[PDB]
Design a protein around this motif. Structure first.
Motif, PDB file in Angstrom:
ATOM      1  N   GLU A   1      -5.171  -3.408  -2.834  1.00  0.00           N
ATOM      2  CA  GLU A   1      -6.811  -2.739  -3.219  1.00  0.00           C
ATOM      3  C   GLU A   1      -6.937  -3.318  -4.521  1.00  0.00           C
TER       4      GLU A   1
ATOM      5  N   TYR B   1      -8.962  -7.376  -5.297  1.00  0.00           N
ATOM      6  CA  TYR B   1      -9.002  -6.644  -4.166  1.00  0.00           C
ATOM      7  C   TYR B   1      -9.234  -7.314  -2.781  1.00  0.00           C
TER       8      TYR B   1
ATOM      9  N   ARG C   1      -1.516  -3.547  -5.444  1.00  0.00           N
ATOM     10  CA  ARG C   1      -2.278  -5.034  -5.759  1.00  0.00           C
ATOM     11  C   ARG C   1      -3.209  -5.110  -4.361  1.00  0.00           C
TER      12      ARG C   1
ATOM     13  N   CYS D   1       0.649  -1.428   0.342  1.00  0.00           N
ATOM     14  CA  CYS D   1       0.143   0.010   0.176  1.00  0.00           C
ATOM     15  C   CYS D   1       0.820   1.464  -0.013  1.00  0.00           C
TER      16      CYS D   1
ATOM     17  N   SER E   1      -8.768  -2.272   1.638  1.00  0.00           N
ATOM     18  CA  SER E   1      -8.585  -0.662   1.209  1.00  0.00           C
ATOM     19  C   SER E   1      -7.407  -0.328   1.997  1.00  0.00           C
TER      20      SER E   1
ATOM     21  N   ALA F   1      -5.632  -2.687  -7.508  1.00  0.00           N
ATOM     22  CA  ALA F   1      -5.121  -1.761  -8.460  1.00  0.00           C
ATOM     23  C   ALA F   1      -4.019  -1.742  -9.249  1.00  0.00           C
ATOM     24  N   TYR F   2      -3.642  -3.083  -9.042  1.00  0.00           N
ATOM     25  CA  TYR F   2      -2.223  -3.189  -9.965  1.00  0.00           C
ATOM     26  C   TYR F   2      -1.913  -4.632 -10.122  1.00  0.00           C
TER      27      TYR F   2
ATOM     28  N   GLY G   1      -0.555   1.882  -9.099  1.00  0.00           N
ATOM     29  CA  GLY G   1      -1.379   1.430  -7.845  1.00  0.00           C
ATOM     30  C   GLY G   1      -1.111   0.399  -6.984  1.00  0.00           C
TER      31      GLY G   1
END
Ligand SMILES: O[C@H]1[C@H](O)[C@@H](O)CN2CC[C@H](O)[C@H]12
Length: 394
Positions: A308, A316, A306, A294, A319, A310-311, A304
Motif C-alpha cells: 500500500e 501504492y 510496501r 500486508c 489497500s 507505506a514502506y 508498514g
C-alpha cells in the motif's frame, strides 16, 4: 528414516513457537502499544524479554509454549496428509551470552514435539533459527537490525550450540524422527563474508560427522543464485548426506509485488526448473500463499507494507485493509491464491518437496496452512488440482 531420492517432503514449519515473531503472534506484542502509538512496542524477542524481566517473560512464555502447538496439532498435520515438520529454535534455548535477557525452557517442549512426531509418523528438521549477534538482522533471528554473527566470538558460540544439538539430536536416540539438522536459518549472504560462512558450514558438517552421526546436514542457500552451492560439500570430496534448503517468496520488493498473477506463476514454475538442475538434493524449506506484504508487522514492528506504498519507498498497489480478513477476499483474489499455491506445489514436488511457512498464525491468513486449508484455498488432499499442469514439467 527418509529416502531423499524417492520420497517427497510434504510439510509445515512450526514457526512462532520457540522464536517469537510479532506478525505471527501479535497478541504478545500489542499490549505494549499506547493507543495508536507503536513506538514503545519491543521489536524482537531480545527486547520483549528484556522489557518484561525474567519472571514475567518466563510466565508468559511457559503459557505460550504449552498452548501454541500441542499433540493435537501433530495429529491434525498427519491427518491432512503431511509427513514432515521443520522446527525453528534459537541459540538461547541452549546457551546464553553474558547479559542475554532471554529465558530458557524451550528444550523440554522440543523433546515433547519429537515424541509427538514419532507417534504420528512425522519426520523433522531441527533448524537453528537465530545465532548470537544475528546472522541477518531480522526480528525472527531474535535480534533485529544487528549483523554481528561473524564478529567477535559469535561464530564460535554458534558452533558450540550446534555441537550440543548434534550430541542430543543427531545420535541413535532420534534417528527414526530427525532427518536433518539445519545449521543456520537465512544467513544474509550479501552483508556477510561468504568465505567465512562456507568455513562455518564446513566446520558444522565435520563436527556432526565426527560424533558418528549420519544425520543429513541442511544448509540454507544464503540467498545465493541457483547452482551456487553445486561445488560445495560434494561426494567427490567424501562429503555426503547434504541437502540445500531454498526459501521462495515474491512479496519482499516493489518489483515482485507488482507482477500480475500470470507472471507470479511463471516465476514459481521457473523455481522448479532451476532447482532440478542443481547437484544436491534440495527442498523448498519455506514458501507461503502470500501475494502481498500486508500482514501486520510482517516487515517488522512499526513498519508498514510496501503493497500500500507505506514502506521501502514502494509505490501504492492496493489497500491492505480489505485483504486482512479472508472472509472479505474477492473471488478473484481467492482464485489467484489457489492458482499460486498449486503452481508452487507442482514446482517443489518436482525436486525434494516443500515446507509451508507456517502451520498457524493468530490472524494472518496468507501465512497459515490451517486457515487456507479450512477455507478451501490449499488443496486437500494436497494432490488435488483445480488448475492442473500450469508449469508443464517433464
Ligand atoms: O517468519 C519468517 C521466518 O522466521 C524466516 O525464516 C523468514 N521467513 C521469510 C517469510 C517470513 O519473513 C518468514
Amino acid at each position: 528414516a527418509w529416502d531423499y531420492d524417492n520420497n517427497v517432503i510434504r510439510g509445515v514449519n512450526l514457526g512462532g513457537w520457540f522464536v517469537l515473531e510479532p506478525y505471527m503472534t501479535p497478541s504478545l506484542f500489542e499490549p505494549f502499544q499506547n493507543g495508536n502509538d507503536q513506538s514503545g512496542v519491543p521489536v524482537d524477542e531480545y527486547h520483549w524479554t528484556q522489557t518484561l524481566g525474567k519472571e514475567a517473560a518466563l510466565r508468559i512464555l511457559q503459557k505460550h509454549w504449552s498452548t501454541w502447538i500441542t499433540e493435537q496439532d501433530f495429529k491434525q498435520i498427519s491427518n491432512l496428509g503431511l509427513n514432515f515438520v521443520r522446527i525453528p529454535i534459537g541459540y538461547w534455548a541452549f546457551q546464553l551470552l553474558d547479559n542475554d535477557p532471554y529465558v530458557q525452557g524451550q528444550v523440554q517442549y522440543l523433546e515433547k514435539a519429537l515424541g509427538w512426531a514419532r507417534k504420528n509418523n512425522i519426520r523433522v528438521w531441527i533448524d537453528l533459527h537465530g545465532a548470537p549477534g544475528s546472522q541477518n538482522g531480522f526480528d525472527n533471528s531474535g535480534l533485529r537490525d544487528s549483523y554481528n554473527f561473524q564478529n567477535g566470538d559469535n561464530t564460535q558460540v554458534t558452533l558450540n550450540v550446534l555441537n550440543t544439538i548434534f550430541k542430543k539430536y543427531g545420535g541413535n536416540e532420534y534417528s527414526d524422527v530427525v532427518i536433518g539438522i539445519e545449521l543456520l536459518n537465512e544467513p544474509l549472504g550479501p552483508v556477510l563474508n561468504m568465505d567465512k560462512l562456507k568455513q562455518f558450514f564446513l566446520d558444522g558438517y565435520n563436527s556432526l560427522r565426527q560424533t558418528g552421526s549420519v544425520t543429513p546436514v541442511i544448509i540454507h542457500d544464503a540467498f545465493q543464485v541457483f547452482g551456487y552451492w553445486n561445488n560445495f560439500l560434494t561426494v567427490a570430496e567424501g562429503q555426503w548426506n547434504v541437502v540445500v534448503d531454498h526459501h521462495h517468496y515474491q512479496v519482499f520488493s516493489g518489483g515482485e509485488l507488482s507482477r500480475n498473477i500470470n507472471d507470479h506463476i511463471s516465476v514459481a514454475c521457473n523455481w522448479g526448473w532451476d532447482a532440478k538442475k542443481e547437484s544436491h538434493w534440495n527442498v523448498a524449506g519455506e514458501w507461503s500463499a502470500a501475494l502481498t506484504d500486508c500482514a501486520k508487522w510482517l516487515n517488522g514492528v512499526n513498519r508498514g507494507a510496501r503493497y500500500e506504498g507505506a514502506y521501502d519507498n514502494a509505490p501504492y498497489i492496493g489497500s491492505c485493509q480489505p485483504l486482512l480478513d479472508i472472509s472479505q477476499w474477492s473471488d478473484e483474489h481467492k482464485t489467484d491464491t489457489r492458482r499460486y499455491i498449486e503452481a508452487q506445489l507442482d514446482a517443489f514436488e518436482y525436486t525434494g518437496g516443500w515446507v509451508f511457512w507456517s502451520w498457524k498464525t493468530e490472524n494472518a491468513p496468507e501465512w497459515s496452512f490451517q486457515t487456507l486449508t479450512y477455507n478451501g484455498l490449499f488443496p486437500q488432499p494436497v494432490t488435488d488440482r483445480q488448475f492442473p499442469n500450469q508449469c508443464g514439467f517433464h
